Amino acid sequence: GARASVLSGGELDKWEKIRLRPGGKKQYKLKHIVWASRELERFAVNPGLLETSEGCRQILGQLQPSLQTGSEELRSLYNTIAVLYCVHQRIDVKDTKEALDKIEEEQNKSKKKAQQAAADTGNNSQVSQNY
Numbered sequence: 001g002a003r004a005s006v007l008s009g010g011e012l013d014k015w016e017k018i019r020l021r022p023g024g025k026k027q028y029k030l031k032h033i034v035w036a037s038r039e040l041e042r043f044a045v046n047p048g049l050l051e052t053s054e055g056c057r058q059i060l061g062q063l064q065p066s067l068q069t070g071s072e073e074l075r076s077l078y079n080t081i082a083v084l085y086c087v088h089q090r091i092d093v094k095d096t097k098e099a100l101d102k103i104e105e106e107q108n109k110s111k112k113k114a115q116q117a118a119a120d121t122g123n124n125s126q127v128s129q130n131y
């Protein structure tokens, strides 16, 4: 039937491998997948999107621009949603940080054009610095 759950057997394997930080000592666990699923529904976003390569991309599109003015909860979300998203796409990052650079490049590639991503937005930022 249709696809269920967030991370399948294979995804779960790599998921447990990925670490929250590039130089930390706390690998990823289901605790983080559920922690976000409960926080997502709070933002009018169903947890069913976490199990969709498309949903994850959308969820990140709302937190991306809200990273600077986003509370600790927002930051944590963009992190988990990142490591997970990379799994539903193809990217096999080792840490959450890497997942940010991978997704940042994909979106940055569009910046060069700024033809479709420069109509709905009101005031874009011309000062992008690395974390």
Ligand SMILES: CCCCCCCC(=O)OC[C@H](COP(=O)(O)O[C@@H]1[C@H](O)[C@H](O)[C@@H](OP(=O)(O)O)[C@H](OP(=O)(O)O)[C@H]1O)OC(=O)CCCCCCC
Pocket (backbone or CB within 6 Å): 020, 021, 024, 026, 031, 032, 035, 072, 075, 076, 077, 079, 080, 096
């Ligand atoms: C307060 C006592 C009660 C807490 C129990 C709370 C209930 C619970 O167990 O929830 C799970 C967890 C929060 O609890 P949890 O203790 O694991 O919190 C995370 C932990 O302290 C990490 O070491 C922090 O990373 P860093 O060393 O600073 O990089 C991370 O980010 P920051 O907010 O500290 O920056 C913290 O969120 O949820 C998430 O947000 C994970 C999202 C993935 C984020 C991955 C990090 C990039």
